[PDB]
């Protein structure tokens, strides 16, 4: 059943629509109704986990969300799961112009 009627999660300022550029990292950025943790990371079907290539970090109802080596077939759909609602957002991430960049 349920642990004991807490109460449901609203989602104040969910992530919203990012913009980068290819050759960098993406930060997300979202304040929760209240506070409680730990909390949850899903993309796509999969569940996230905590590591190298992705970070999680939360303080005062706020998560962050780091990903390295941003690339043009990253960009999807990053809903995280906490509460009883939740919130899905998408990132933008435009390939390099392959100028004369060293590289």
């Known amino acids: 059943g349920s642990s004991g009627s807490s109460g449901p999660v609203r989602f104040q300022e969910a992530l919203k629509d990012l913009e980068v550029l290819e050759g960098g990292a993406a930060t997300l950025r979202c304040v929760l109704s209240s506070v409680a943790a730990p909390v949850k ?4 079907n999969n569940v996230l986990r905590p590591g190298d290539k992705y970070s999680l970090r939360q303080e005062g109802a706020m998560l962050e969300l780091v990903v390295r ?3 043009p077939q990253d960009s999807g759909r990053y809903s995280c799961s906490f509460g009883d609602q939740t919130t899905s957002a998408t990132l933008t991430v435009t390939a390099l112009p392959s100028g004369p960049s060293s590289g």
């Open 41 to 44: 990371w899903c993309y796509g």
């Open 69 to 71: 080596n941003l690339r």
